């Protein structure tokens, strides 16, 4: 499978969900606001007091390590800058503080990350499990 050289539409929903969770977990970690956390996620946090921080940082790490092999970024700091920007916009979005133009920027960046993760063999390996 290394020696067999290589759209992934079927992973789209799981990938948007991964991204949306990383965002929610990242914000909850910084705010302590756990208001629209799923009851299942709330129960995981009960057993383990580092669960949330570990989930958010684990998921960010997976995105960066995946996308460091994508031709679309030239430096590590461009990649992290783009992720940090998605995260920042999401914080503004959570409090209904985006202009229409910023909402465009947010959705465009969320879709770009979605698309580039679908193109990452390493990310697909990770989703498969």
Sequence-distant (6+) residues with CB within 8 A of 55 are: 21, 25
Sequence-distant (6+) residues with CB within 8 A of 94 are: 27
* DSSP collapsed to 3 states, 34-50: CCCCCHHHHHHHHHCCC
User: CATH code at 9?
Assistant: 1.20.120.590
For this PDB entry, the determination method is X-ray
Contact 98/106 with Cβ under 8 angstroms?
yes
| Number of compact structural domains in the chain | 1
At how many Å resolution was this determined? 2.1
Q: How many helices (H) does the chain have, and how many strands (E)?
A: 6, 0
Nearest to 86 by CA among 61, 60, 119: 60
Residue with tokens 């990242």: 26
Sequence-distant (6+) residues with CB within 8 A of 18 are: 59, 117, 127
Q: Which domain holds residue 92?
A: 1-129
Residue 95 phi/psi, 5° resolution?
Answer: -110, 25
Residue with tokens 């970690």: 29
Q: Is 24 helix (H, G, I), strand (E, B) or coil?
A: helix
Token pair listed for 83:
């992720």
């Amino acid at each position: 499978a290394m020696l067999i050289l290589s759209p992934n539409f079927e992973y789209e929903e799981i990938t948007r969900s991964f991204l949306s969770n990383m965002l929610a977990f990242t914000r909850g970690h910084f705010t302590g606001d756990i208001s629209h956390f799923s009851p299942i996620v709330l129960a995981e946090m009960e057993k383990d007091p580092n669960w949330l921080e570990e989930a958010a940082g684990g998921m960010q790490g997976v995105i960066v390590q995946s996308l460091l092999e994508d031709e679309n970024f030239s430096s590590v700091e461009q990649l992290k800058g783009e992720l940090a920007r998605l995260i920042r916009l999401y914080f503004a979005l959570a409090k209904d503080n985006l202009t229409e133009n910023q909402e465009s920027l947010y959705v465009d960046l969320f879709d770009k990350f979605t698309f580039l993760l679908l193109c990452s063999d390493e990310f697909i390996m990770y989703l498969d499990s």
